[PDB]
């Protein structure tokens, strides 16, 4: 009985693969050969921020292009003024096992999550003069892996139980749930339009959701290993994924297929973060080789190297205006590059 | 030349001082990871130690040391992903139920041989030793381990299963403190304390430059 619909699904995959292959009239790798490369790129650590004392995990740039958020195994969620190294807040967490963080676009909220399965939202503009827990969202059955703000009232999250959800903060309930992954989802990233987002899971599949209908609208399967980080191309038409196979891959949302792959023969370690620059010409990624490497997104050449950490990097992010890029490692330091 | 943000600068310095003073106080505790199969004596050992849908952090103090005793078994997801978070724990409080083995052994092999835990020692509490006597009297262990030979006796059975656990270690650089649970307490705490003292001495003597 089930075998009939199983064969129907198999035929569906065969025909969708045929259609996907039919769209490959050319490739970006051969079209791009007409344009010149960006040349060799180098950068220096303009600041070394060393407030933390144990194993920074995740970070996020504020909208003001000035304020940083970072979280560590030490249990201190502290936010930094990048221009002048000053601390401005130290938020003591109820549990030290953090794995992700997010800074709201308006700057009024910072969100934290970890193995405790609960997402806690901290308010910054309280009249009392100190931060306080606005809400503690609950309902998941697996470790949180990424949090992002659509606005001050709606937060989206990705968890270790193979589901993603969108929360109405003012009511503390999962207003819409996204499902269909086989493995658990490791990271999440939402488009500038805020209408649609992607997430990657340990089953090597990365797929596109929309935040209003809740349907899974596209699925990509290029990798061979667990997905570990995703970030959109700045114009919202494409995104790149990092995987634990030393190769970063770029997918196009309208072609619905892989366009190019970034790899080099001497690297075998796993990816930990991915993020484009403001123009989209440059793709920055983190590695377990204790360093950071930057690729020309349209040439797939290792145009530069950003080494300088004593331990593997675990987070990365460029500013919303492209002025600088920040990265953090288990050595408990954040570097600022230009 | 600084503006009147000197107050912000001094506030940042105060935050740094407070963070350092909190970290130095927090560093005094010893961190343990408690692990095992479901029902495999975790509840028994924590209860006899006489002292939220995911991780749970038991906490108790003994001999001027505060033991943070984390139980990660509550979570149900890909172990290979979240396991790296518990790096730098001083020891693993592993425990198995003797009355129940062929998958607990695989889990122990995975944990002891993991990339991250290459250097950390392991305490291995054999549990349910009391009713294991009834188990061995009522049924032979050969149905569990066909390769076994020799007498069906309590002490040799315990020694053989302990050797089976011990043999799966790949590197001689780590110790494995096996001990019986005896469901009576007031002694296993001394065992874990001795293991922690050995680990502290080893770490201090390695860092100070004798290794």
């Amino acid at each position, epitope marked *: 009985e089930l075998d009939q619909l199983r064969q129907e699904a198999e035929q569906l995959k065969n025909q969708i693969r045929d259609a996907r292959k039919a769209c490959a009239d050319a490739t970006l790798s051969q079209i791009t050969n007409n344009i010149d490369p960006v040349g060799r790129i180098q950068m220096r650590t303009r600041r070394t921020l060393r407030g933390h004392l144990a194993k920074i995990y995740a970070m996020h740039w504020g909208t003001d292009s*000035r*304020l940083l958020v970072s979280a560590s195994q030490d249990g201190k969620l502290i936010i930094w*003024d990048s221009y002048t190294t*000053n601390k*401005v*807040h130290a938020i003591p967490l109820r549990s030290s096992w953090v794995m992700t963080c997010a800074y709201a676009p308006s*700057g009024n909220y910072v969100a934290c999550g970890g193995l405790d399965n609960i997402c806690s939202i901290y308010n910054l*503009k309280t*009249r*009392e*003069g*100190n931060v306080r827990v606005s809400r503690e969202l609950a309902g998941h059955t697996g470790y949180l892996s990424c949090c992002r703000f659509l606005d001050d009232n709606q937060i989206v999250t990705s968890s270790g139980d193979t589901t993603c959800a969108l929360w109405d903060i003012e009511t503390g309930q999962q207003t819409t749930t996204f499902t269909g992954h086989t493995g658990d989802v490791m990271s999440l990233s939402l488009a500038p339009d805020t209408r649609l987002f992607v997430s990657g899971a340990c089953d090597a599949s990365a797929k596109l959701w929309d935040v209003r209908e809740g349907m899974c609208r596209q699925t990509f399967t290029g990798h061979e290993s667990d997905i570990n980080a995703i970030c959109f191309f700045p114009n919202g038409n494409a995104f790149a994924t990092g995987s634990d196979d030393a190769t970063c891959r770029l997918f196009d949302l309208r072609a619905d297929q892989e366009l190019m792959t970034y790899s080099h023969d001497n690297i075998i370690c796993g990816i930990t973060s991915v993020s484009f620059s403001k123009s989209g010409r440059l793709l920055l990624a983190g590695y377990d080789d204790f360093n950071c490497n930057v690729w020309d997104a349209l040439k797939a050449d290792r145009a530069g190297v950003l080494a300088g950490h004593d331990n593997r990097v675990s987070c990365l992010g460029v500013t919303d205006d492209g002025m600088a890029v920040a990265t953090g490692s288990w050595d408990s330091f954040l570097k600022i590059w230009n | *030349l600084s*503006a*009147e*943000e000197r*107050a*912000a600068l*001094e*506030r940042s310095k*105060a935050i740094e001082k407070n963070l350092k003073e909190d970290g130095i106080s927090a560093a005094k505790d010893v961190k343990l990871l408690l692990l095992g199969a479901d029902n495999s004596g975790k509840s028994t050992i924590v209860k006899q130690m006489k002292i939220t849908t995911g991780i749970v952090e038991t906490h108790f103090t003994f001999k001027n040391l505060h033991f943070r005793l984390f139980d990660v078994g509550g979570q149900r997801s890909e172990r290979k992903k979240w396991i790296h978070c518990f790096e730098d724990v001083t020891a693993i409080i592993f425990c198995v139920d003797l009355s129940d083995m062929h998958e607990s052994l695989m889990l122990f092999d995975s944990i002891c041989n993991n990339k991250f835990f290459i250097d950390t020692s392991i305490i291995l509490f054999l549990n349910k030793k009391d009713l294991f006597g009834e188990k061995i009297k009522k049924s032979p262990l050969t149905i569990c381990f066909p390769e076994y030979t020799g007498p069906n006796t309590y002490e040799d059975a315990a020694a053989y299963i302990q050797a089976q656990f011990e043999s799966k270690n790949r590197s001689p650089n780590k110790e494995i403190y096996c001990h019986m649970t005896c469901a009576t307490d007031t002694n296993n705490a001394q065992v874990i304390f001795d293991a922690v003292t050995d680990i502290i001495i080893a770490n201090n003597l390695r860092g100070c430059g004798l290794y």
Partner: single-chain antibody
Amino acid sequence: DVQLVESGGGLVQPGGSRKLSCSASGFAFSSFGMHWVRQAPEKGLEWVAYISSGSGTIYYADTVKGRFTISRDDPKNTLFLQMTSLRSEDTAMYYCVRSIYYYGSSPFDFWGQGTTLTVSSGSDIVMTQATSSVPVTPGESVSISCRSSKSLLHSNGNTYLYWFLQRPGQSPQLLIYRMSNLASGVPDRFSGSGSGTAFTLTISRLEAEDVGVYYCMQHLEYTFGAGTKLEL
């Protein structure tokens, strides 16, 4: 809610001494700095003393230094000012005011009720204001201006102007800080503007709730304008 209250007023013999204290509740006092400012019955505001969080720093006005001293007791959430050698110039109400300093924060956001004190007979950048008062009617728009002897703009890109409102029979309230940002809870119809040494506060769709006196303030370095009145 947040409450700042003070006590110790009344009358003083000339040349005597009096302890004045401030009481705070509803907020983490230890994380905030505190200023003490005073208002003569026939003059504008004048600054007196300041201490940062944790009592790490302290400042006094040159005309009040030595005669007065201030300190705070964080566990009791109380602030103390000790007065000695009181003279006729010292008669005024004294306001206990809140402050906090970090990027994006707004100082001087809340003011206490104040205590009256009277006595019987026995680098200083100056701010200027164009007029003592102007007439206005509800529904119209009017502009207020103040000027500084030195440029209040700083090399970091900010300018440290502040505008305060004091309604009759009430304590002051913060309207505009950093010369362009509106304080929390202030109606959106207030707005400041200016550059260099010439600064202007503007109001449109004026309402009877805006009738009062406006005090121009600077905060660049270690003063208040004479104040201007709005009459319906």
